[PDB]
């Protein structure tokens, strides 16, 4: 909850300098923890209590509701694209970097 | 619930997905987020003029009128001076200028002068354009476009940058040229939403004169959210639907306080957001028509991998 | 087609706009391969089938070959407003936000 | 009898005596022979067009719009038999 | 509003001002009549000029105009200073001519 808190942060102070990197570094890793804590609270309201026995609760209900808030219809393909045009053509080399599947081209050549 | 309003929700939802959805957000949601008022302001602006604010109660004609006067009398000076100190403030964005973004905008064009809505951007992570001037216009360094009517003091510390005083509604067309030029480029190819307006706003009649001025029938007619805490009336709602706004009221929907805005604002819109094609679907009559739509294209196709067929189905 | 036509095509202009009533432009796209939403009616802009446009400004013989379609008399020109608002105001939409090469011309024109 | 009052007073019979004024008579000599005010009018299009006269006040906006709305909603019919009954009374 | 509108936007300071007769009952605004005045629209006010209650509704209208009526060149005058100038601002074109007959001087001073 403190890192989602700190990563809204670090997005919402990067509109001066034209950082774009720090910007758009922050923003698909605000969806990576995002996306670490959906299977995060799925694995403990969900799963009952099977590998620990007792509920935890490290996020609380209104934690959960305000994340979906803003989470809400979000597609990381389009990360990349939805970025100026500036750092488009100027930070091209972290274009595979919103796709989901970026482990894949690392993963065809490993195969 | 009701079948006027969840026919208007299909066509908005399948816009979001295809990319040629304009939301069109008032100021109404500015006061979620707890921001002073248009009507403080000219309140703050009549004290100044008469020395005490007016006991009765102020008319549509006294919001536009007072600020005249007081750019007159007082001067462009004091003018700015009562703005950057009832406006230059820093404020949470709502929850509805989030789930604003949620359906994805080709652009958005708000009536609102502050940066609530740009922070919006940069927080959900799509980067739209900020227009405000016609410099702005110019340079486009990206296609989806936001749309300040008036636009804050970035174009230097002076009292052009915004649009209050009477005349300037006027010379509207003529001070603002491509912004008003692409504001209405923008509704003949784009769906348009209104949502934060109390269906009696300047911006939202005078553009609706254009379009039932001399428009034909090529334009779409754009949705209208009235959040008003009071029901719609028939006969009112009869006049906007032969002007072309269908009106999507929210007491109809959902029946709350006079005050709860936020609860009224979040129930209609999020219910804009949950309800997707399949959740319209009631019996077999609408299963078949559905399932065949999306599938329809595929028979041309000999074969069709089985595996990724939950593309077409939305996963 | 003219040779001219293939040359316009290679830098792939995004929203291509001519003041031509015919399609020998529109056949000369598909010969590159090239896609392109013509929009020549007042009612093509709000049913565009994509974003780059074949801006036909004035019109074209799509819909027939009748001079309702098509702006060649005078009073069409005094009624262009009139006739086609949306066409008009979208044509002036892009000339701000793009880069604009002016080819086809005498330098007389009264369309230009 | 005051001041920039008699200066304007004289160019007005200036003109007057010139033989080219022009009067921009408005709405405010018809209340002067008890005439039906068209803001009341529009009171009564709410009453039939609503059903009941809202207590809010009619403001500027709301002087404009009735009419509209009782026109397209009602009908031409219903608009102008109105105007031919309520209007046709002749007054001094 | 309108036709001040139309003043405004495409009329310079060539064309005459035209002027309003106030008879709302209350006394007017400094502020207003300088924008209206700006505006080229010269306010006449009948509260200022005649104090009436606010029932006044009629009979304000009239209390200017019979005023306006009565307004005559010669009820203006209160002493020589100026007599002079008006009777000298009528016969000063008859100089030209080198002899008026007395008889037909009554045309010039409204008989």
Redesign the interface.
């Known amino acids: 909850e403190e890192s989602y808190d700190l990563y ?1 942060n670090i ?2 102070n ?2 001066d300098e034209s950082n774009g990197c720090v ?1 758009y570094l922050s ?1 698909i890793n605000r969806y990576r923890i995002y996306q670490s804590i959906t299977q995060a609270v799925t694995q403990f309201n969900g799963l009952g209590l099977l590998t620990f026995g007792r509920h935890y609760k490290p996020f609380t209900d209104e934690f959960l509701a305000r994340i979906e ?2 989470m ?4 990381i393909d ?2 990349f694209n ?5 750092f488009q053509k100027k930070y091209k080399i972290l274009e595979f970097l919103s796709d989901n599947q970026f482990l894949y081209d690392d993963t065809v050549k490993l195969f | 619930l009701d079948n006027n309003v969840v026919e208007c929700i299909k066509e908005i939802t399948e816009s979001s997905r295809n990319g040629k959805l304009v939301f069109f957000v008032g100021a109404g949601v500015s006061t979620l987020s707890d921001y002073p008022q248009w009507w403080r302001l000219v309140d703050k602006y009549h004290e100044e003029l008469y020395g005490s604010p007016k006991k009765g109660n102020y008319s549509s004609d006294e919001y536009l009128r007072i600020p005249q006067i007081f750019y007159n009398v007082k001067g462009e000076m004091a003018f700015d001076g009562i703005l950057k100190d009832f406006f230059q403030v820093d404020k949470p964005t709502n ?1 509805i200028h ?2 604003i973004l ?3 905008p080709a652009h958005v064009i708000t009536t609102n002068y502050d940066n609530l809505i740009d ?1 919006a951007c ?6 739209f ?1 900020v227009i405000s001037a016609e410099e702005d216009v110019a340079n486009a ?2 296609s ?1 476009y936001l749309l300040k009517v008036a636009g804050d003091f970035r174009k230097g510390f002076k009292g052009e940058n915004v649009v209050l005083k009477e005349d300037d509604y006027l010379n509207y067309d003529q001070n603002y040229p491509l912004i008003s030029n692409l504001m209405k480029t923008i509704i003949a190819t784009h769906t348009i939403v209104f949502i934060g307006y109390g269906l009696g706003d300047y911006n939202i009649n005078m553009l609706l004169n254009w379009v039932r001025k001399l428009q034909k029938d090529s334009f779409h007619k754009p949705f209208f959210i009235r959040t008003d805490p009071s029901p719609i009336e028939n006969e009112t709602l009869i006049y906007y639907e032969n002007k072309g706004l269908r009106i999507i009221d929210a007491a109809s929907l959902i029946d709350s306080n006079e005050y709860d805005y936020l609860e009224r604002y979040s129930a209609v819109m999020d219910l804009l ?1 949950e309800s997707q094609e399949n959740k319209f679907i009631t019996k077999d009559d609408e299963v078949i028509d559905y399932i065949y739509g999306k599938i329809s294209p595929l028979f041309a196709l000999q074969y069709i991998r089985k595996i990724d067929l939950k593309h077409v189905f939305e996963y």
Do not use: C, H, V
């Open positions: 809204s997005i919402l990067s509109i910007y923003q808030r803003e809400t219809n979000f597609n389009d990360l939805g970025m100026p045009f500036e | 929850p989030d789930k949620a359906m994805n922070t940069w927080k959900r992570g799509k980067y354009s360094t990206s989806r957001i």
